[PDB]
RNA sequence: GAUGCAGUGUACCCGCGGCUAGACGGAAAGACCCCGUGAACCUUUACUGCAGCUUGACACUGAACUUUGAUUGAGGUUCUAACUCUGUCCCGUGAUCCGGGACGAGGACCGUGUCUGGUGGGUAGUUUGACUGGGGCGGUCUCCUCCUAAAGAGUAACGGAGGAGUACGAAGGUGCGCUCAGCGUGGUCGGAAAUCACGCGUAGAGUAUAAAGGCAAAAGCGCGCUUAACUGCGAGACCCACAAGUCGAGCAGGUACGAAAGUAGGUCUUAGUGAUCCGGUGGUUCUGUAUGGAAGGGCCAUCGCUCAACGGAUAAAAG
RNA sequence: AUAGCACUCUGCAAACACGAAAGUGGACGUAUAGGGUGUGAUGCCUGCCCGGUGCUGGAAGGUUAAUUGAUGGGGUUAGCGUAAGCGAAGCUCUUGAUCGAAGCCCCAGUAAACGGCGCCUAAGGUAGCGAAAUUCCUUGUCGGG
RNA sequence: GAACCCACUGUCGUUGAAAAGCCAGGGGAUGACUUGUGGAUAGGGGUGAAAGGCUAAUCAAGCCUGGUGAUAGCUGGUUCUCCCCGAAAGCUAUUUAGGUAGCGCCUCGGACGAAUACCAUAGGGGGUAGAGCACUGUUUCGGCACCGAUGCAAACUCCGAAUACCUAUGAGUACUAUCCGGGAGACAGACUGCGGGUGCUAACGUCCGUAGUCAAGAG
RNA sequence: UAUAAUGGGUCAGCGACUUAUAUUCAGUAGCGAGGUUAACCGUAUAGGGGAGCCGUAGAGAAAUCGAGUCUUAAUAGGGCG
C-alpha cells in the first residue's frame, strides 16, 4: 500500500530578535510572533501581522504588568 | 557559460527592456580639457575632427565641463553646458 | 465565480482601477468615488 | 576568433558606473490580485547581485 | 570462505607414473538485472512530414441550336479544327521501333501544369518524466497548520495527523453602543430541545474556512454615515544561493467619520498560486531610417491559453 | 506447399507489378481466362448476429478550401476661415457579404469481409466433441491392463 | 535395390585429418528428379514450396572508400626533484538523483588592525528533561450527570531546570576578525558515544541532531 | 583492499594538456593625462603611414541635460554618480 501522510509547510523563522539590555534604533523589529505573546509598551509599535517594532532609539526592556498578567516589551530612551 | 544545471537562467527569467537610439551612436561628447589639442583659436566640429578628439562619422558634438583650459577659444556650432560656457568666457573666449 | 471588472474615471482622463465582482449577487453596474491622480481630485468611477 | 556576446543577456543588462542594472520580474500579466505596495516597489530598476556579476561579465564581455 | 596475518601441529633435498579436491583454475571488459536525457529493427486509434489516392478553381479549350432557376450561371442536343488511338493503308525501307501522308473510331471529353480540401504505418524522422531499502505495479510531485525537533533559528525518512487552488461593496473605514455559552425555578396546542422573567457558578461561546498562536481599548456582537480596498513616496529592520518574500515610523496632495485628541495605504494573522517569450486593451511634453506624417518600437497600467512533473526541455509526443 | 473448395476484382489501351519517363511483364492471352485472399484429398457437413470497423449502392437534406470580392473602418493629400478645428477625389492599409466540390452527417445491403455468440444486448452456441497439443483446483470419478 | 542426390540416430573429434568431418546404421532413387556450360535479377534493393532463410567462411539491412579526428554527463591512462598551506562528501535548484550551477568548506595576492576568540561578571527570552492533573483525552475502586481516592499521554499542561543562545564591561594569552580580487577541489561517506523516528528496544540495517576518529595519520 | 576486486610474461625503443585568435587578472619595461598603430609603402626588424582603439563623466528606455541626473505637482523624499 501507501501512506496518506507526508506533507509539511516551509519554516517561518518566528521568535525574538532583540533581547533585554540591547540598544535599538527606530524601526528595528524586536519580536516576530503569530499571536500577541508579547504586548507593546512605551515607544513600541504593533504591525498588521502582530510584529513588534521600535519607534524610538533606546534600550529594550521586558516586563510583566497588568491585571491579566500580560507580558510587555518596551523601549527606554 | 550561463548554464545553471537546468533551472531557468538569470538572463532568461528577467524581462527585456529598452530600445536603442540611432542618433546617440552619432552624437559625441567632448571634455573641456581636450580643447588644448585643437590647433588654432577656432573650435568647431571640423577642427575637433582634425584634432582627432571626435570620430569622423559623428554629426554633432557637445562640450562638457571636466577640466581646466588656459586659452581663448571661439566656439562655432557646438553645444555648450552652463559650466563649459562660463569657463570659456572666463578664459576669454566667445560663443558664436 | 467572481469576475474581474474595471472602474473607469468619469472625468475622461482614462484612469481606471481593477477589482472583482459577484455577478449573481450584483446584477447592476458599480459606481464609486475614488481619487484620480491625473486631475488630482476625487471623482466618480463607473463599471466597465 | 573574436569573443561573441550573448544577445539575450545583452537585452536584459545595461552597464552602470560600478556595475549592472536591471528591472524586476512579476510585473507582466497577473496584477489585479497584487497589492498596491508590491506594484509600486517592484516597479523600477535594481542592481545585479554580486553572486551573478561574474556570470553577467562572462555573458557580456564588451560591457 | 587465507600457501603468505595470529596461535599452534607436522615436515631431510630432488624426480617419474597416475588423479582432479583447491588455487573464488584458463577461455570471452556478464547475454540475466539496473543505468545512460546510448543504438538498431518492428507495431499502432503516440507526435510530425512526404509519396500514392481522391475533390474542386484556372490554362491547354473551340463552334452552332436550345432548356431552366435566383442581370446572373446551371444544364440539354449537335459539329470539328485543338487533342487521343498499344486501329487499317502508302512512303523513308530489303524494319512490329520512329517520323510524314490518307482513312477510320472518339472529341472539347479524357489526360497534363499551377493552386487547393480530404485521405494516407505505404514510407521517413522522432518521442514515450522523476522519486523508489533492485526494477516493475501502486502511491507522490506546488502551498498552509501540529508532532517528530534534543526550552533561540534551522533540521531527514514510501514517518504520525489534517487543510488549500476561495469568499466579502460589506464580511472594509470611522463614531457610538453591547457581551457569550451552560445550569436552577414558572408559565399556550411548545415538549430532551422553540420564544419570555429572575437567580447560580463561570469563558467551557464566538471569531466565513483546517490547525497553531492569540482576542476586554475585546480581534466577539449591533446601528448611523461613508469608500483610506487612495496617489507620490519612505528613515529603519526581518528572512534569503539567486530569482523572490515580509514589517514599517514619518512627509506632500485629495478624502471618510468624530465636538475634539484622533483613526483609516482593506478583512485577528499565518494557505487561496505561475517566472520568461509571444499576443490583446487604455494613456503617453519618448522614438519613429531624406523631410512632414503614418506603420512599427519604447515607457506607465492592465488582460488572456498553458506550464499541478506546479524554477515552467520546442505552449506539438505511445508501445 | 499440394490437388480440391470458396469469396472478391478484371470488358482489353483489362486488373495488377516494375520505372522518373519512354516503355516492359500480364499475353503474341480475352471471363472455361488473368490477379488478390482464405481453407486444404475424401465421407457427413458447415448454426445465430450487420450492433462496431470495413466494402457496395442511394440520397442531396446541413457543414466549407483554393478562387471571387458587397460593405465597413484607418493613413496621406485639396479647400474655406483674424478666430472654429474642420475634412474631397486619387493612392494606399485593413474587414470579410455572397458564390464555391468533396470529405463528414443519413438510409439500405453484405459474415467461406475483419469480427461477436450474457436484469441486459446486435444475438447470447445448431450439428458435433470434451480433464481432450485446450482443465488452475488435479495424481477429477469409475472400468481394463 | 547400386551409381547419383540427401542428412533421421549413435560413437569419435572440439589447440580436429577437417573454421561443420569420419565410421556404423538411415531416406529418395522416371521425377515437383539430379547435373555441366553460358546468361538475368544489387542493398532498404534482389530472391525466397516462408526458416527473418540466402545474397563470396560476413546479414533484423552486404562490402570498400569518403563526411571522419562522428558524439560518448562513461571506463582506463597521464612520465623529473624539494619547500609551505591544506578540504569536502553539506544546503538550495535542476527530465535531477553516479552530471551541473550558486552558497558553505581550501589556497594565493591586496586594503585594514583587536573592531575576533577563550574565561569571569551583569542583563535577557524560553517550555525540553523532570514533574502534575488545573484544560483535552483516557483508567480503576467506592457514595449519591455529580463527589472522594487512584494511575496514564509525541501531537495534554497549574509548573519547570541543567545546558545551549543574544547583548554589555574587563584581566591574561593568542596576528584574530572584516572587505576586494586570482585559482580550485567537492556535492557515493564510514564506525563509535550521547538524544531520537522507523525496525522486533533485530541487523557491520535505515533516516536526523550532536561530539571524536578514519577518510587524508605512522608510533 | 594482503585481499580470492582491476592491470601488467620480461627487456629495449615509441606513447597523452598543444597551436591560432579574442578577452580577464598578475608580474615586469617604456611613456604618462595621455598611450598606441592596422593594412600598406619601404633594396625592408629602420624610417614613413593617425584611419582606428583604450583612458579622460555620469544620469535616464529615450528625447535631453550635464557634476549632476531620473522619479514627482513638489528647490520634499529616494536611487544612481
From Swiss-Prot, chain A:
Keywords: Ribonucleoprotein, Ribosomal protein. GO terms for molecular function: structural constituent of ribosome. It comes from the Bacteria. Residues 1-13 are annotated as: Disordered. GO terms for cellular component: cytosolic large ribosomal subunit. InterPro entries: Ribosomal_bL27 (IPR001684), Ribosomal_bL27_CS (IPR018261). Pfam families: Ribosomal_L27. Disulfide bonds: none annotated. One of its GO terms (biological process) is translation. Belongs to the bacterial ribosomal protein bL27 family. NCBIfam families: L27. This is Large ribosomal subunit protein bL27. It comes from Acinetobacter baumannii (strain AB0057). The lineage of its organism: Bacteria, Pseudomonadati, Pseudomonadota, Gammaproteobacteria, Moraxellales.
Curated annotation (Swiss-Prot), chain B:
GO terms for cellular component: cytosolic large ribosomal subunit. One of its GO terms (biological process) is translation. It comes from the Bacteria. Keywords: Ribonucleoprotein, Ribosomal protein, RNA-binding, rRNA-binding. GO terms for molecular function: rRNA binding; structural constituent of ribosome. Binds to the 23S rRNA. Part of the 50S ribosomal subunit. Belongs to the universal ribosomal protein uL15 family. This is Large ribosomal subunit protein uL15.
UniProtKB/Swiss-Prot annotation, chain D:
Belongs to the bacterial ribosomal protein bL35 family. NCBIfam families: rpmI_bact (TIGR00001). The keyword Amino-acid biosynthesis does not apply. Keywords: Ribonucleoprotein, Ribosomal protein. GO terms for molecular function: structural constituent of ribosome. This is Large ribosomal subunit protein bL35. It comes from Acinetobacter baumannii (strain AB0057). It holds the Pfam family Ribosomal_L35p.
Amino acid at each position: 500500500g501507501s501512506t496518506k501522510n507526508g506533507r509539511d509547510s516551509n519554516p517561518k523563522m518566528l521568535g525574538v530578535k532583540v533581547y533585554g539590555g540591547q540598544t535599538v534604533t527606530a524601526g528595528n523589529i524586536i519580536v516576530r510572533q503569530r499571536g500577541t505573546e508579547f504586548h507593546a509598551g512605551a515607544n513600541v509599535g504593533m504591525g498588521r501581522d502582530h510584529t513588534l517594532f521600535a519607534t524610538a532609539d533606546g534600550v529594550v526592556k521586558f516586563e510583566v504588568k497588568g491585571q491579566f498578567g500580560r507580558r510587555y516589551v518596551k523601549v527606554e530612551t | 557559460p550561463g548554464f545553471e544545471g537546468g533551472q531557468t537562467a538569470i538572463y532568461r527569467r528577467l524581462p527585456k527592456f529598452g530600445f536603442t537610439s540611432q542618433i546617440a551612436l552619432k552624437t559625441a561628447e567632448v571634455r573641456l580639457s581636450e580643447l588644448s589639442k585643437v590647433e588654432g583659436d577656432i573650435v568647431s566640429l571640423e577642427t575637433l575632427k582634425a584634432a582627432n578628439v571626435v570620430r569622423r562619422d559623428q554629426i554633432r558634438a557637445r562640450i562638457v565641463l571636466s577640466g581646466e583650459i588656459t586659452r581663448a577659444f571661439t566656439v562655432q556650432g557646438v553645444a555648450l553646458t552652463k559650466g563649459a560656457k562660463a569657463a570659456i568666457e572666463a578664459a576669454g573666449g566667445k560663443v558664436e | 465565480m467572481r469576475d474581474k471588472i474595471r472602474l473607469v474615471s468619469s472625468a475622461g482622463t482614462g484612469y481606471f482601477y481593477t477589482t472583482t465582482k459577484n455577478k449573481r449577487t450584483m446584477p447592476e453596474k458599480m459606481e464609486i468615488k475614488k481619487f484620480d491622480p491625473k486631475i488630482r481630485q476625487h471623482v466618480i468611477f463607473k463599471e466597465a | 576568433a573574436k569573443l561573441k556576446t550573448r544577445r539575450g543577456a545583452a537585452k536584459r543588462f545595461k552597464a552602470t558606473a560600478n556595475g549592472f542594472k536591471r528591472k524586476q520580474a512579476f510585473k507582466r500579466h497577473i496584477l489585479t490580485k497584487k497589492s498596491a505596495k508590491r506594484i509600486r516597489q517592484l516597479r523600477g530598476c535594481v542592481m545585479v547581485h554580486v553572486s551573478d556579476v561574474a556570470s553577467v561579465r562572462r555573458m557580456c564581455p564588451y560591457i
